C-alpha cells in the first residue's frame, strides 16, 4: 500500500493473508465461514508451494490471540483466468475447516448489485504489499483511501489503453495506490466489498497507470456456484 498508513489492528476482520510457504504472498478477503476470495494470478507461479490463509492478523510476525493459520483444502481459480490477461482474476480458497469467528475474524458481505461505483468515491484498500518506491513490505497491515476513476479515462492509451472491461474498475494511483502484495485484497466502499486488487505486474504510485480492481458483482453467479 503506497501513500497509506498503518491500519487499526483487527478493524477489518475479513482481512486475510494468502500465504505461500509461510510467507505473505497475497491479500484476501473472507467471504464465507470456510471461503476466502483472492486474485488468481497469485497462484500462477506458486507451483508446489504450501498455500495457507492467515486470519485474525495485523502483524505478519508477532503473536496475537486472534491469529490463526488455516491450511487450504481446495483452490478454485476462475476457469477463464489466464496468465496473459487481467480478466477474471479471481480465486476462491476453501479452508481446512470453518473459521473461528470473533471480533477479529468475520466474513464480509460482497456487492451483488452489478452497478459501477460513482467516480471520485473514496474506497478503502488494505494490504501487506510494497509501501515505498524501494519495493519494501510492512510487517503490520496498511490501508489507503483511493478515489474511483471512470472507466473511459482509465481506458485512454496514456493509461490502460482499453484493458478495463465492464467487469473491472480503477482508482487513481497518484502518490496513493495498491502495489505488489496487495493483489487479492479488498476494495471497500460503503463497508461493502466492491472490488479485489489485481495489481500484478504494474508499478505503483504513478498517476499515468491507475490501479486496477476486479468487480465482485460481475462474478456473483460464479462465487455462489463455488460456495454452494
Amino acid at each position, epitope marked *: 500500500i503506497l501513500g497509506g498508513r498503518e491500519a487499526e489492528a483487527h478493524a477489518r476482520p475479513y482481512m486475510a493473508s494468502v500465504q505461500l510457504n509461510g510467507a505473505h504472498l497475497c491479500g484476501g478477503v473472507l467471504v464465507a465461514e470456510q471461503w476466502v476470495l483472492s486474485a488468481a494470478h497469485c497462484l500462477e507461479d506458486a507451483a508446489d508451494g504450501k498455500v495457507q490463509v492467515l486470519l485474525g492478523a495485523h502483524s505478519l510476525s508477532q503473536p496475537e490471540p486472534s491469529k490463526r493459520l488455516y491450511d487450504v483444502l481446495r483452490a478454485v481459480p476462475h476457469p477463464d483466468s489466464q496468465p496473459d490477461t487481467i480478466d477474471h482474476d479471481l480465486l476462491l480458497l476453501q479452508l481446512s475447516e470453518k473459521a473461528t469467528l470473533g471480533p477479529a475474524v468475520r466474513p464480509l458481505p460482497w456487492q451483488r448489485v452489478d452497478r459501477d461505483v460513482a*467516480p471520485g468515491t473514496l474506497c478503502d484498500v488494505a494490504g501487506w504489499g510494497i509501501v515505498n518506491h524501494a519495493g519494501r513490505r510492512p510487517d503490520s497491515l496498511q490501508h489507503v483511501l483511493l478515489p474511483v476513476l*471512470d*472507466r*473511459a*479515462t482509465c*481506458n*485512454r*492509451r*496514456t493509461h*490502460h*489503453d*482499453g484493458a*478495463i*472491461t*465492464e467487469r473491472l474498475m480503477c482508482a487513481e494511483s497518484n502518490r496513493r495506490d495498491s502495489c505488489k502484495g496487495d493483489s487479492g485484497g479488498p476494495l471497500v466502499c460503503g463497508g461493502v466489498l466492491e472490488g479485489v486488487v489485481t495489481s500484478g505486474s504494474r508499478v505503483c504510485g504513478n498517476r*499515468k497507470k491507475p490501479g486496477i480492481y476486479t468487480r465482485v458483482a460481475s462474478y456473483a453467479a460464479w462465487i455462489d456456484s463455488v460456495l454452494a
Partner: antibody, heavy 115, light 108 residues
Framework: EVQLVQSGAEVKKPGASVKVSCKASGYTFTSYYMYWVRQAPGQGLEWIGEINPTSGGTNFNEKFKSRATLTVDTSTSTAYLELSSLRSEDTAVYYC????????WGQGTLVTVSS | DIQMTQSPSSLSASVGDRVTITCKASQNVDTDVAWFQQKPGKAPKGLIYSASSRYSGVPSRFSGSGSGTDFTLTISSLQPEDFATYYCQQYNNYPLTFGQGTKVEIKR
C-alpha cells in the same frame, strides 16, 4: 465486428452549422473516449477534441473550442460533432476515432463550405 | 503545445529497402507515441502505439522505437503496399498533436 459509422458528406453555405454523427457498434460505447480529427484537402491531421460518454465531459484543442460542440447519445451509442458559423477554411474531412484499444476510425465525413 | 517534427517530408525508396521515418517531440512525451499509415482518399490506419507496440494485424516489417523526444518508424523490407504517407502522433499532453507527414515514394 467493431465499426464507426459516420454520417454522409455535407455541402454547406458560409454561415451555417453542420452536425456530423458517428455511431459505434461492436463494443461498449461508454467504455472509451471518442476523439475527433480534421484533415483539410491535401493537408495533415488536426486533433479537434474528445468526449467522455459516461460524464459528457470534453477536452478541446483551443482552435475549435469556440465553434465546435461534442455531444453523446448514450441510448443510441452515437457521438456527435457540431461545427457552427462555418467558413471556407472549415472545408475538410472530419473523422471520429476511438481513444483506447485498437485504432478504430470512421470512414470520414466530408464537409464542403462554399458560397 | 507539443510539436511533432516529422522528418523527412518525402522519401524515395526501392522495394526491399530498410526505411527510416523520424519524429521529434519538442518536449518529453514519454512513449505516448503512435504511427499511422494513410493511402490516397482513405482514412488513417493505426500501425504503432506506445512508441514500439504494433497493432493487431500490422506486419512484422513495421517497428517503432524511441522514448522521450526522438521517435522512429522503421520498415525493414519495403513492400509495394507500403508506399504511402506516414504520420506520428503524440498522446501525452493536450492538445494531441500530429507530425506534418512523410510520403514514401518509389525510387526510379
Amino acid at each position: 465486428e467493431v465499426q464507426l459509422v459516420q454520417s454522409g458528406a455535407e455541402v454547406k453555405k458560409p454561415g451555417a452549422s453542420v452536425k456530423v454523427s458517428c455511431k459505434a457498434s461492436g463494443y461498449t460505447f461508454t467504455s472509451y473516449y471518442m476523439y475527433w480529427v480534421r484533415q483539410a484537402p491535401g493537408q495533415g491531421l488536426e486533433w479537434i477534441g474528445e468526449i467522455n460518454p459516461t460524464s459528457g465531459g470534453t477536452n478541446f484543442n483551443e482552435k475549435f473550442k469556440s465553434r465546435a460542440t461534442l455531444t453523446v447519445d448514450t441510448s443510441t451509442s452515437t457521438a456527435y460533432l457540431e461545427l457552427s458559423s462555418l467558413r471556407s477554411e472549415d472545408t475538410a474531412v472530419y473523422y471520429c476515432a476511438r481513444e483506447g484499444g485498437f485504432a478504430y476510425w470512421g470512414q470520414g465525413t466530408l464537409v464542403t463550405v462554399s458560397s | 503545445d507539443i510539436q511533432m517534427t516529422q522528418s523527412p517530408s518525402s522519401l524515395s525508396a526501392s522495394v526491399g529497402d530498410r526505411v527510416t521515418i523520424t519524429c521529434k517531440a519538442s518536449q518529453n512525451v514519454d512513449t505516448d507515441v503512435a504511427w499511422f499509415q494513410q493511402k490516397p482518399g482513405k482514412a488513417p490506419k493505426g500501425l504503432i502505439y506506445s512508441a514500439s507496440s504494433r497493432y493487431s494485424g500490422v506486419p512484422s516489417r513495421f517497428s517503432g522505437s524511441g522514448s522521450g523526444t526522438d521517435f522512429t518508424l522503421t520498415i525493414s523490407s519495403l513492400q509495394p503496399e507500403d508506399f504511402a504517407t506516414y504520420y506520428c502522433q503524440q498522446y501525452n499532453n493536450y492538445p494531441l498533436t500530429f507530425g506534418q507527414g512523410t510520403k514514401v515514394e518509389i525510387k526510379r
